[PDB]
Design a protein around this ligand. Sequence first.
Ligand code: MET
Length: 530
Amino acid sequence: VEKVFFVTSPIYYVNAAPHIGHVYSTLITDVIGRYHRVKGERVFALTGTDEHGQKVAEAAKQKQVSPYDFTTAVAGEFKKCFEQMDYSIDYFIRTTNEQHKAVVKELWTKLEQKGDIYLGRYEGWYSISDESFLTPQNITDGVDKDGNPCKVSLESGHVVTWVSEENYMFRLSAFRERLLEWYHANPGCIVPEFRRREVIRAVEKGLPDLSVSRARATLHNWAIPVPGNPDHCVYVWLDALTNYLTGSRLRVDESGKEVSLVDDFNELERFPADVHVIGKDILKFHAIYWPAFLLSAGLPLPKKIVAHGWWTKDRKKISKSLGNVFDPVEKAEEFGYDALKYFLLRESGFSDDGDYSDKNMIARLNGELADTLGNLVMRCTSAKINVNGEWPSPAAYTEEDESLIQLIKDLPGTADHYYLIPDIQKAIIAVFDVLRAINAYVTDMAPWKLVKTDPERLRTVLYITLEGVRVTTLLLSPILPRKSVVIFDMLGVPEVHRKGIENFEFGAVPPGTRLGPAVEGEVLFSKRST
Ligand code: MET
């Protein structure tokens, strides 16, 4: 099946300003999208905001403004933040959008016609802050914002409330067996593996039916009405997850505005998602509820859900109320955008709860970006080493030459696999393993000495080095989008050879290609003091 590769981020609640977790999640979405464009594939990358519900509506009452005005302002803050982060996201969706509402109503009606929705009751715990239903085994004792004793979530530590309401219920219990069939028939559909095992364990135990509406008063009427029943509003999560379907059905103009909603997802060839990027906090919604709603509605299921961990700064929680902030724009302005992106993507795998510190950020910038990559780019473009400012023609290869050539030839296949898991950390590590080898080759060959001593040999060493830099850079280009362009310019790589699987091949850029102009004081990654 050739289709549009469809990658998504979560849509974020707009109760508060955008912060590191949102930037991180959308970055991972963006990188995956960028990588597939570089392979020459059609790509649709989606992100946006989750704007209904009690959480958001009560956050707006606290600031004492209209919910329309509140959501519009905060959404604008998210949009501004993502523009500034310099992503290449194809569309930013808002659940307040009138076309999204239509899709939600259409899906609700499908589930109902299917016989999977009945009028019943939820009597149990609920976390407003997570918009999540919880069993008693998943709550514990704690203190509210006044220090009085209350109940809170084991998952998140937010205050839980007891809800007792007549609600429309989805027959999630009926989908246990099909969900298990699905997890087992597609054992790469949840990444990383231990989160996949977590989901299977939970569904093995059995599933209760799920409340998919609430009484309209409880929601302060800030939600989508249930079709045919004005007294109920649709569960914010059913509304929210539907953004993926909505997103798959929107024709978008050149300025990123939605101009049309198509009747059937097949028309745009995006649905279902090839990868849903999510944080571990919302696994159940994506890996249990979502596929159950799709099975009910007769819609195809996503190929992969990837769930990452949470960040800390200096081994402590990130918060404004506590004395520990982490502003990604400010850190990007301080250290550079591609560098900050590299760090967030290199420092932690999706299994781990990663940690930022200025110390570690600088060690990576200095060690990997500057000393390993930057150093190497300057050497092979240097007028002192590359006297003619060109890609030379190689003479015969020694076994050492070939050992390095083999590493460069094998790198794309290996990096490809890692990007497709996805495991962006391993992909980066694989590229830099090859960069380190190219450096050790250059040190071994000492091409500066060869300029006087063996210019024929220098041709070979210099050529292999240029091509190693080009290939490594091509594969890192989803990670370092701006800097890879600079590198390609310095190397003088023609535009055509900067994307496409054709240019994964060793030798795509011919000898005689001229290097780009050298600039007075340019340096690729500027080292920073410790
Ligand atoms: C369908 S993705 C919804 C995610 C939710 N708004 C959150 O911020 O956790």
